[PDB]
Amino acid sequence: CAEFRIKYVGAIEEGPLDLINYIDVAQQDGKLPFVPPEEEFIMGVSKYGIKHRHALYLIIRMVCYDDGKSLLALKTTEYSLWVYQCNSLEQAQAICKVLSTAFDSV
């Protein structure tokens, strides 16, 4: 149950490499924007779910790269692809670390 600081991007109504592309296509079209508004939201990573809540069983994959900022990607379930934006890469990678044991928590 740790809390974080992020920026929001948007949502859609085999490996992680494919997930990055689907954002880059939906970004070059205009479905989801590149640079977000400065509005800072809390992304709490609890045992219950991603605290607007997301499951821990239905979640599949988390990706973080460098679009000196970063990006984020989820996979809840017809599939969903929730996209965010982190302050840096290290903190974006640090969120994965929480999911590494929160998965082993259930």
Partner: peptide, 10 residues
């Protein structure tokens, strides 16, 4: 060292 990290659901 790393550049892009991920975690898969078992």
């Amino acid at each position: 060292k790393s550049a892009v990290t991920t975690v898969v659901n078992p």
